[PDB]
């Protein structure tokens, strides 16, 4: 069903799974459109693995923003934080996975004094 928090409405949860991936190990759950001929899912038989459509698209006014109602931006050092100084209340910052504890403390403190929220603030400590 639809999920609605604040103004952000997510039109569908529980991401689509590939047909028959439940009962075949070689078939990964990642969605693939089934070509088939008599394919059930392709023909849209009721009660079987509905396919993604453009109609599920979230509205463009609130498309990419996180539950904190702002867009995420992934940074790798303190230098890539400069553009956030202007839109600190529209963007949250996430530190890249391959950033060391050297630099993570620096990015955390810089974002703190920049007044921009950090997503994975308590990582690697």
Partner RNA sequence: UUGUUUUCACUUUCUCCCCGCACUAAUGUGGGGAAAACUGGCUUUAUUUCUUCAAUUAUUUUUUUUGCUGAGGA
Partner RNA sequence: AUUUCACUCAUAUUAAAUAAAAUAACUCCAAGUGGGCCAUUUUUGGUAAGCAGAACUGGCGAUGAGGGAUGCUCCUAACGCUUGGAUAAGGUGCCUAAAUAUUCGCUCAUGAGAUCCCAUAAAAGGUGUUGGUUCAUAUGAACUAGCCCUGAAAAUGGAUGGCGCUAAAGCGGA
Partner RNA sequence: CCUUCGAUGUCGGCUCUUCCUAUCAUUGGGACGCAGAAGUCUCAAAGUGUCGGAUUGUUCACCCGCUAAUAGGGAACGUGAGCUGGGUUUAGACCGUCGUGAGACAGGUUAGUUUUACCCUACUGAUGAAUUUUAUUAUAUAUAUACAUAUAGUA
Partner RNA sequence: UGCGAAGCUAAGUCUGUUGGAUAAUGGCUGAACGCCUCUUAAGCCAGAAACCAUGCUGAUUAAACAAUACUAUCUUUUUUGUUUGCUAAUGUAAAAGAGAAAUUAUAUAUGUACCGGUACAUAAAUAAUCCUAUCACCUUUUUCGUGAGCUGAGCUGUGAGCUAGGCAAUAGUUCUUUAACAACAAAAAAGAGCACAAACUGUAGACGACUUU
Give contact residues for RNA (rule: CB under 7 A).
1-2, 7, 11-12, 37-38, 42-46, 50, 53-57, 61
Query: Of 43 and 124, which CB lies nearer to RNA in the complex structure?
Result: 43
Query: Of 35 and 122, which CB lies nearer to RNA in the complex structure?
Result: 35
CA distances from 67 to 3, 17, 70 (A): 12, 24, 7
Q: Alpha helix (H) ranges present in 1-125? A: 101-114
Query: Of 55 and 67, which CB lies nearer to RNA in the complex structure?
Result: 55
Tokens read off for 98: 């391959």
Query: Of 45 and 83, which CB lies nearer to RNA in the complex structure?
Result: 45
Least separation, in Å, of the C-beta of 21 and RNA?
A: 21
Least separation, in Å, of the C-beta of 37 and RNA?
A: 5
Find, among 101, 102, 112, the residue nearest to 93 by Cα. Answer: 112
Least separation, in Å, of the C-beta of 88 and RNA?
A: 22
Contact indicator for 82, 21 with CB cutoff of 8 Å: no
Least separation, in Å, of the C-beta of 36 and RNA?
A: 9
Find, among 98, 90, 95, the residue nearest to 107 by Cα. Answer: 95
């Amino acid at each position: 069903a639809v999920k609605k928090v604040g103004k952000i409405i997510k039109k569908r949860t529980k991401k689509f799974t590939r047909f028959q991936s439940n009962r075949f190990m070689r078939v990964k759950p990642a969605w693939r459109k089934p070509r088939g001929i008599d394919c059930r899912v392709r023909r849209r038989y009721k009660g079987t693995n509905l396919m993604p459509s453009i109609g599920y698209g979230s509205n463009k006014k609130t498309k990419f923003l996180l539950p904190n109602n702002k867009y995420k931006y992934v940074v790798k050092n303190v230098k890539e934080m400069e553009p956030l100084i202007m839109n600190h209340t529209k963007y949250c910052v996430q530190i890249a996975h391959n950033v060391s504890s050297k630099k993570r403390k620096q990015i955390i403190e810089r974002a703190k004094q920049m007044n921009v929220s950090v997503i994975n603030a308590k990582a690697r400590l």
